[PDB]
Design a protein around this ligand. Structure first.
Ligand SMILES: Cc1ncc(COP(=O)(O)O)c(/C=N/Nc2ccccc2)c1O
Ligand SMILES: Cc1ncc(COP(=O)(O)O)c(/C=N/Nc2ccccc2)c1O
Lengths: 271, 271
């Protein structure tokens, strides 16, 4: 793996061993802050402008002012890849509520850029679908316990015992026997992987329905998968007691996995 | 005011100027953590055992292990009051998700004890009730904006357009014309001030109903008030367009304010 030498705090490259915040930061005291996370390959953060747009939208929703414009943040991110001498990386952006003279009032958010090594494994996909559970409904990390204990590696939620509700971590998709792709709607552009995969499905001539999913629809679907930054397209083989196909990646899920890699390749060709 | 010289990080008294966490702390990266906040007067944290019990319960709910038992944490808190040479103080306890070798897995929570000066003003109460709004339903600090903009200093929530829902920051009480005190129920002991004030009301021979409050009940109440650690008993003079009495503290709210001071005096007599 790779020694990461530097993070970035408020536009200054800081050796990892000195990368600290004073405990008056409102993320420490009150968990007030936003983040984004994205990959880089061949020295380029993937779909970067979409991630940065999401990051600036998240900040404005919390009334936190990012201390640099998008072009400047983009420069800092590329400057940090070059300083750490990595071509493949995970990049975390953090905007805290910042240092507050009174432990409550945001007065100046703190901006962190952190960097991680990816194993070659990060870019590979399993033919074996994962096993998840449904669950009525901090919440997300708390839930790791219940999850591992039940022999699942993730979950989706049911609402009023009726409606599938996505976790924070992933977008959830069904493929119906007629090859209709079904996924929850969005008010504004949140899922970056979700967007590239819906685009790839429609370009391939698949029907994509963006709508509420009823619990009964898990029993009608041929395939189930997640999208996320880290997973890309990840096949779900089992939901509670429901096996999808033989538990291995479905036909459309496999096609969308390959088309997503195509979207990442096409993105990198424009860099 | 008072120079605070020291905080406590993981059982070590640290000069405030050196009190920092490495950015791998999961409170910085993911807002994963708990806290408690309480006052001290005459060199004693108020109702300390109830606050510590709440703190240990909050931690166990997030599967975070506090590195010291209750007696040891209590010692650290008194040792910090003595090191800062303060008799009147605000004390914040923070337990973060801690430093994680992979930015996701809690591996060792970090414990912070921070200390603040109280103005003599912190112990005084206003005869003038505050002005709040109702509102359908991070959320809490985000809401300061809407609040100040509407000429309110706080809010309570309405659920399904039907039921009063308390904010995180305060417990909400009505006093009906027959002097029935009404407040939302609790599953386990959360509000410390709430508990002392309900105890004081019942000892005085008032009826206290712990139950769901319907929106229509704001129109039937003679008085409205908040309890919290910082506010003690705080009169609410106006909710949206509803003035309570002439906007000044009601009879029962004033009696409960005096009885709460009595509970604090009695507590300090046992120290
Ligand atoms: C540009 C690019 N080129 C090839 C592969 C596959 O190399 P091969 O076809 O020889 O195995 C990937 C995989 N991404 N996988 C991925 C991307 C984002 C998130 C998760 C997985 C890629 O991103
Ligand atoms: C022990 C004790 N003794 C007196 C006063 C009042 O002094 P006087 O009656 O002469 O004005 C207070 C006020 N607490 N107020 C308070 C306590 C907790 C939270 C908020 C307010 C007190 O806590």
């Amino acid at each position: 793996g790779h020694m990461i030498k530097y993070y970035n705090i408020n536009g200054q490259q800081v050796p990892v061993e000195n990368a600290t915040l004073h405990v008056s930061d409102l993320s420490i005291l009150r968990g007030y802050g936003i983040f984004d996370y994205f990959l880089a390959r061949e020295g380029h953060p993937l779909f970067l402008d979409d991630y940065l747009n999401r990051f600036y939208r998240s900040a404005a929703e919390l009334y936190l002012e990012i201390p640099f414009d998008k072009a400047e943040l983009r420069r800092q991110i590329y400057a940090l890849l070059q300083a750490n001498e990595v071509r493949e990386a995970g990049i975390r952006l953090v905007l805290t509520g910042g240092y507050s003279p009174d432990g409550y009032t945001p007065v100046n958010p703190n901006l962190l850029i952190m960097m991680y090594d990816l194993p070659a494994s990060a870019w590979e996909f399993s033919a074996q679908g994962i096993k998840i559970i449904t669950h009525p409904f901090s919440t997300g990390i708390r839930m790791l316990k219940t999850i591992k204990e039940r022999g699942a590696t993730d979950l989706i939620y049911v609402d009023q015992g009726e409606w599938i509700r996505e976790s924070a971590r992933s977008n959830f998709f069904l493929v119906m026997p007629d090859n209709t792709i079904v996924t929850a709607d969005e008010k504004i552009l949140w899922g970056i992987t979700r967007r590239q995969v819906i685009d790839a499905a429609r370009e391939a001539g698949y029907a994509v329905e963006e709508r509420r999913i009823h619990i009964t629809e898990l029993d009608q679907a041929r395939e189930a998968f997640f999208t996320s930054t880290i997973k890309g397209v990840m096949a779900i083989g089992q939901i509670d007691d429901r096996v999808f196909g033989d538990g291995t990646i479905g036909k459309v899920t496999q096609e969308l996995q390959d088309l997503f890699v195509g979207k990442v390749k096409a993105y990198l060709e424009t860099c």
